Amino acid sequence: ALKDQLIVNLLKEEQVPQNKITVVGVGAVGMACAISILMKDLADELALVDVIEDKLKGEMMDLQHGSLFLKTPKIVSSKDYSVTANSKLVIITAGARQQEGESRLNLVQRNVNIFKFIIPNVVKYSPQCKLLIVSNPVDILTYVAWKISGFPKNRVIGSGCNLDSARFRYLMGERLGVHPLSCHGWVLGEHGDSSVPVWSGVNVAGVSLKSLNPQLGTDADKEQWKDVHKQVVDSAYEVIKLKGYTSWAIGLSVADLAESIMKNLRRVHPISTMIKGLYGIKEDVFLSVPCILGQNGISDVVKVTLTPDEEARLKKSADTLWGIQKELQF
Amino acid sequence: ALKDQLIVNLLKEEQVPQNKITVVGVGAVGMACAISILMKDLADELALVDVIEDKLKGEMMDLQHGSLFLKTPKIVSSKDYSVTANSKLVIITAGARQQEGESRLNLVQRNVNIFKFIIPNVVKYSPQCKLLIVSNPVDILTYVAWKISGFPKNRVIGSGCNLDSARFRYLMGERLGVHPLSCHGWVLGEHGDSSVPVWSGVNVAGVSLKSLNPQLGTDADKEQWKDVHKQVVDSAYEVIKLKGYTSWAIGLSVADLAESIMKNLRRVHPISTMIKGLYGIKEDVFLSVPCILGQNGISDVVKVTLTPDEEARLKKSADTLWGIQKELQF
Amino acid sequence: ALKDQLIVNLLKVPQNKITVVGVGAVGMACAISILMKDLADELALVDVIEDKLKGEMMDLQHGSLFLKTPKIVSSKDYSVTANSKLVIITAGARQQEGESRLNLVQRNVNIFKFIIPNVVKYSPQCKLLIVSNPVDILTYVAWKISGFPKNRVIGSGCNLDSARFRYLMGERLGVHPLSCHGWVLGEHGDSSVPVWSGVNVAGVSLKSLNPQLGTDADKEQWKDVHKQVVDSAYEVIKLKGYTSWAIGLSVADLAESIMKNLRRVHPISTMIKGLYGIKEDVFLSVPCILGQNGISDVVKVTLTPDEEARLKKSADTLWGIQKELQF
Amino acid sequence: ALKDQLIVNLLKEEQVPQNKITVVGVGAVGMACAISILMKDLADELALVDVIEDKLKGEMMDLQHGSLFLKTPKIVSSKDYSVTANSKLVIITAGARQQEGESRLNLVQRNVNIFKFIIPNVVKYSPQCKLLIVSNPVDILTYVAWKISGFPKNRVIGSGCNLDSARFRYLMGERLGVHPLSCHGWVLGEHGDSSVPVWSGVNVAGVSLKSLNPQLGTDADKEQWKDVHKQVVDSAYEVIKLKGYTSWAIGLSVADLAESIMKNLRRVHPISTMIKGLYGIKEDVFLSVPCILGQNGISDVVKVTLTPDEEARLKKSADTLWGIQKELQF
């Protein structure tokens, strides 16, 4: 054989990848997560899983054809979860997605049912993985993945408000003529309608925007900064109406979180985690708060100082999620 | 205003971009080119142009929402070509795309008519740009864009066989257990059915695969390496049959060419250029040959030493393209 | 010729050129950091020591296969610097063991009287990025000699002091420095100002959880973090003889904002006359918006009376030195 | 404490580095390797080792102060090898360096004595490490590291001719007006005076330069391409004469090898390995040949087809290296 005339083999290697990432779901979200991760050189192996055989195979082949331009030596796919074995990070993007005008909370039963099959299959092949939930409603589905997996809470993460906060920083950046990297602001709670903008922490170079404008984010704000939060809430609905779905921004948001996990950065991200014991919350509610994210997942939570109105809005987001969460059939 | 209390302006904002890229067409190919370019930090401004208003705005908005994770501070869109002003590179992806069982050659009348509108509008606003043609049939469309634009031939580049060669290299790599970066091989001629695998130049570490196996690429080959070229030819059709279209690999192949142009690398790529005067070709045929690509586009053409059968196959590819090209009216 | 048998030539100025003046440890660290961040299509090096200059250029050229900067050039002659978008000056006497950066001033001013007109002659529209010490005074000096408008004369200033501060804050908290926010302003030296009022994690003011933060009465003595920021260069000089790596990375950070027109905010040296309560033509670090045209805007930081007094003291210290200087 | 007021700890330590690199020696080569590795984001932890305490601490601190600009969250140092624990790769740059007019082969006795201390201390704390030898004479020192460590051959690599080949490609590129990435050519054998330019493999886009000029690399060559290999041989001495030492190009060459290892790329590099059994070599000689490099080090060797003259020059290099090997006192 030609391979043998050209090359002399020294050993049969173990082959087990050291930085493998699995993406579950090859829809628009899943593929945007896949491309972003490949262009960030985060993994030595990428695995894709879906239920539509043709689409899964087509997507895998199309990424594979770009291998020359990448540094991810192995790209694989299968409907069988054995393809996901030894993943460091498994990203779940599978399930029903919002239609035009549809609340993310409307996807709950359909996605809890899908998660009942997915989660035991992921766990079986990667018992030491970190789970990164992207499927919606993300907060409730992070709780679902946690309960099903049996994993400790540090290893079950939801993409949460990482994108909501990125959108907030982009809009603030556009209003001020400053790059979003130099605009600071936190959107917490549900990744949806009940999210909370933390006006007290909104700043550029550590200068509180609220110290210059005390009415910042209120109805009495002459510049109406609350419309920035309204744009954050409405963004996914506005994008879906225009292009039928969202993909690029969530893909970048997920690869940003994947980078912190894979590279053990210990950067702070507003992501879905259990908030039991914070702000008077007594139940197993999962929603976004600023978390320290690394190789072991969420190791710590930043206790944000909320005004009484900000805390009341966060407890409202918590009540909305727990109302659905507490009555789940699984 | 809050902005003025926070920031003291010391310079009048008369912003002109220095490394602007425009992507014409927001279909799956155009968006894969856009995300790949954004993630490679090649531009300081990205402009998108299309004819479907909603889809165009949705795509622009979705990219802008990922700005925090990028280093391209300005993302814009419009149906109006004034939005593309001062681009250094303009990437053309617009037009009809081949259906399952349809040749890229069959899109020619539809795409020439579209180019008659797009090309003059692009050159009107970006007099310094290089035109990077991606729409199909890419070889005939590069010739068409060249003739319409009034640009010199070095500045009108067709993505051509850069993707066929990357596909070939990936497949060769899979067979050998070597990264595509270390598997060398050139697929030239039409970016389509009549492409030519240059078996004589196929090598690993300077070792000719044809020297070890003389039957390489022929029907007599026991390992059937000709199936690698057949898979290269069939790849877009196979992927279209599986996922409905191709996007990722073409996106990365175009970003690869964009990097060589923007960074003036003078790397060699198999891309569409005028071959009149080479291999006895007498007509104004555009096809892929290894070209040196930099800040002024195609500055030089490498003269590949082809076996008598490889040369005849290349002249056959040229004849096929001329057969379609000679009947065009524009 | 082999080249003509292989290649058919069809077509017989760089667009993103950067020049580094000075091939000392600082200059070479700026050079490697810029090459490894793919910011330039052409890098030029300039120095007065011909052998050292050529050897550094050749050493960089030999790594060309692992880079994406296709032209690396050098000369003692400034004609090599023509068409630079950005010119970084790292040349002159460098900080010595147990000595203030203010002790290099007159010698570096005399050297800039030669360098600056030569840079200006070949790239009249470049952005000048001053790294040489004392950076705040030398930025003012380069501004005066060049005749450039103030937006195009930038000093590396406190970008490194703030980076050191965020690393030290990060080590105490167990958080990546990217998630630890806090600004060190004024002189890139002993009179720098830690802005405790803006120090935060996830928008949470550290002063809100420790009102005494940064003062003598602070039970956790966070003033020691700023003391570590001040002492850092002296400590590194004592141990290894000079500093190079952290400054090269800080300079490449500023070069990225300029070259990619990011409009990110950096604490860098700029003309502060009329701002923050200062009446003289003093340059010091304040948070600036940095892009393709250099410093376009200045962020007006809300400083506490203590912080404002310290910044005024830093301005007074620099003005005092600058006053008694000849050029 | 302020930390406890701001952060709730939820986990539980277990901080084991997953992609750790160690650099032994903090001279100019060791620091150029360190800065290049840091700027390529290859490691989650970087450890430095040396015998000069102040120099080592000052270098560590200077890298640490640049952390905000990096993605390697742990930079450590010590004269104690326990600091290198759990490294995936250990880079050895310690030892005497050659003076002008002094052969790298003259460093043998001083460097072997140093390796007798370093090697057992390195291997002790890192079960999974690959040993990457940079110190000179590199080929002899790779054999020495292999004998002292008791490691299998796949795990002991010498930086060998990776830099000689990069220099060759750079110089070829300069003559042809082509980027080094598109200029192919191998310099094999000893990383020193007896290296072998493989003219038969020298090519652009698969085109053999020797097939265009049969006299290529011989004294009969009108263009004297042999001067390119002479410049490769003399390059370290020319740089040493001008600036006192070489650092940047070797740092980049070592980071290139570290990238193939850390990311399991399976790219081909001309690096020091055992050649017993190839080209009639019957002894345990280490020298550069093209190797497939990945996570388990050198898993495979490319059997380059050499002309009788190239093979004779390669065996001559092996004989020279074997001669020095017979002088080793373990």
Ligand SMILES: Cc1nc2ccc(NC(=O)CCNC(N)=O)cc2s1
């Ligand atoms: C039992 C099941 N296992 C899977 C696995 C993958 C998918 N795939 C998607 O849901 C892709 C499209 N969805 C979005 N949101 O992109 C569906 C199912 S159902």
Ligand SMILES: Cc1nc2ccc(NC(=O)CCNC(N)=O)cc2s1
């Ligand atoms: C006169 C015209 N100008 C344009 C500009 C853009 C587009 N957009 C596409 O065709 C994108 C979808 N198609 C593919 N190939 O992705 C069509 C036209 S028609």
Ligand SMILES: Cc1nc2ccc(NC(=O)CCNC(N)=O)cc2s1
């Ligand atoms: C009239 C003059 N032009 C120059 C240009 C470069 C240099 N080079 C250095 O000073 C490098 C070493 N110094 C530090 N600080 O690294 C000195 C002079 S004097």
Ligand SMILES: Cc1nc2ccc(NC(=O)CCNC(N)=O)cc2s1
């Ligand atoms: C028993 C010993 N262990 C070590 C470890 C490191 C070093 N360090 C250097 O040799 C740095 C300077 N040399 C080069 N080549 O840069 C020397 C020794 S001696």
Ligand SMILES: O=C(O)C(Oc1ccc(Br)cc1)C(=O)O
């Ligand atoms: O992936 C491929 O081979 C090519 O992809 C496309 C390139 C440009 C457009 Br517009 C549409 C498809 C092809 O179909 O030629």
Ligand SMILES: O=C(O)C(Oc1ccc(Br)cc1)C(=O)O
């Ligand atoms: O530039 C080069 O070729 C090489 O550089 C070094 C390699 C290892 C050490 Br330790 C020091 C220098 C060489 O001298 O072999």
